[PDB]
């Protein structure tokens, strides 16, 4: 009932936890997110995400699908800007069969010409569906506006590339980024000796391996949604800095979203700030993204098209308040309780815990128990929070919007 963690000579982290539950769940996490694409292979990691049931050396495309379904299985693939994660769930008696599959897909895909060719239109489908959620518009643009290089890359292949990702490119991406050095093999409901064993033999992939440069920019998308999404961010702090915890707390001061169904959000600075003047449909939330080597911090509005000027300003002003001192301890206590509570809740599940343990394994090289985390959140000073707010107001801005942007301001309109 304790997390066991080991690192191999070759750099591969292994974490497990025998909780003797009826279900077993294994993740292979990989420093292989969209940030690792260059201007020449854009979209490759997207295709790679979609491609997990193509034929491998060890099992046919048919065998992966039928074999996993036989036993009530699930094989699944997640990407952020920085990581990819291959997860298998099943009943505990069959982890053997699923590990076999997981190792095949990550260790020896074949990416046959005809299968890859065939999968190409899926790029468009998966992308098209994704872009239905207008948050994805704004957020992907936002990253593109903010950075010039890696974190700039969108997670979904750009149109000009759909049809045009090659077998060779898929191969290169895997061979170059799926290396022992850049993987974490996480395991809930299995024995740690057996994970070590598996990783020693089967994840022995010879280590085949720029800082993200935030520049600041602005990207507008005209349509006629009549609701305008906008995000406004400044450079923040990377994960693992105590600055990072400062921003996280500032996020929860300003308000990152609702705690009550149909809520008024009495406790959200931002929400009440907007609402003191504009009395119609809107939403607002602090945005906080913290990456290996950078971070974005700010807020996101959803306003009427006509009201976006009035809303974005009202929101920005609220952050200026914090930056110029106005923050009670009541407020910062509320913030920390929220963050503390929300953290613990986010690791309530098998899903959430696995993601956290694997996440940390890559990012640091270690496990931080929830107790220590809470200490680090308690350890943030109201001065640190006022500093983080100061940092945003004064820092160089990146912005992205979409909607009928008639009354949506440019950065240089404050």
């Amino acid at each position: 009932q304790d997390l066991e963690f080991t690192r191999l000579p070759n750099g591969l982290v292994i974490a497990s936890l025998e909780n003797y539950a009826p279900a077993s769940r294994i993740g292979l996490f990989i420093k292989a997110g969209s940030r690792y694409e260059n201007s020449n292979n854009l979209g490759t990691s997207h295709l790679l995400r979609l491609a997990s049931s193509l034929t491998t050396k060890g099992a046919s495309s048919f065998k992966i699908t039928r074999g996993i379904e036989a036993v009530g299985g699930k094989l699944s693939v997640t990407s952020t800007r920085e990581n990819m994660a291959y997860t298998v769930e099943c009943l505990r008696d069959d982890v053997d069969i699923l590990m076999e599959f997981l190792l095949n897909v990550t260790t020896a895909p074949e990416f046959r010409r005809w299968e890859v060719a065939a999968l190409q239109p899926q790029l468009r489908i998966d992308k098209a569906v994704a872009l239905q959620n207008p948050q994805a518009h704004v957020i992907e643009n936002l990253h593109a506006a903010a950075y010039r290089n890696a974190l700039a890359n969108s997670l979904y292949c750009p149109d000009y590339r759909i049809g045009k990702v090659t077998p060779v490119e898929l191969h290169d991406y895997v061979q170059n980024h799926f290396t022992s050095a850049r993987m974490a093999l996480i395991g809930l409901g299995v024995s740690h000796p057996v994970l070590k064993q598996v990783a020693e033999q089967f994840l022995n992939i010879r280590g085949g391996l720029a800082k993200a440069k935030y520049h600041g920019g602005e990207i507008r998308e005209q349509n006629g949604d009549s609701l305008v999404h906008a995000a406004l961010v400044a450079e923040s702090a990377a994960i693992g800095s105590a600055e990072a915890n400062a921003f996280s707390v500032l996020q929860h001061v300003l308000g990152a979203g609702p705690h009550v169904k149909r809520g008024s959000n009495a406790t959200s600075s931002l929400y009440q700030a907007v609402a003191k003047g504009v009395h119609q449909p809107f939403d607002v939330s602090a945005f906080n993204a913290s990456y290996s080597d950078s971070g974005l911090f700010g807020f996101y509005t959803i306003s009427q098209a006509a009201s976006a000027g009035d809303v974005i300003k009202a929101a920005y002003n609220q952050v200026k308040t914090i930056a110029q001192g106005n923050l009670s301890n009541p407020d910062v206590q509320a913030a920390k309780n929220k963050l503390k509570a929300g953290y613990l809740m986010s690791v309530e599940s098998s899903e959430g815990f696995l993601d956290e343990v694997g996440s940390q394994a890559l990012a640091a090289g270690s496990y931080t128990p929830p107790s220590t985390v809470l200490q680090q959140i308690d350890a943030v000073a109201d001065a640190d929070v006022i500093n983080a707010a100061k940092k945003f107001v004064s820092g160089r801005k990146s912005m992205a919007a979409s909607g009928n942007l008639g009354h949506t301001p440019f950065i240089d309109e404050l």
């Binding site: 997207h46 995400r49 979609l50 997990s52 049931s53 992966i64 699908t65 996993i68 379904e69 299985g73 699930k74 094989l75 699944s76 693939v77 997640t78 990407s79 952020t80 800007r81 998966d126 569906v129 994704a130 948050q135 994805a136 704004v138 957020i139 992907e140 990253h143 997670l155 979904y156 609701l227 995000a231 996020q251 990152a256 979203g257 609702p258 149909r262 809520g263 959000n265 119609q280 449909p281 809107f282 939403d283 607002v284 939330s285 602090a286 945005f287 906080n288 993204a289 990456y291 974005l296 807020f299 996101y300 509005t301 959803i302």
Partner: peptide
Amino acid sequence: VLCRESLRGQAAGRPLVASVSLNVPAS
């Protein structure tokens, strides 16, 4: 969307995570 109630909880604060599966819909 035609009301604050329904609209709220849309404002993003998660940098995005794309997840696609074998036998579970994409998100």
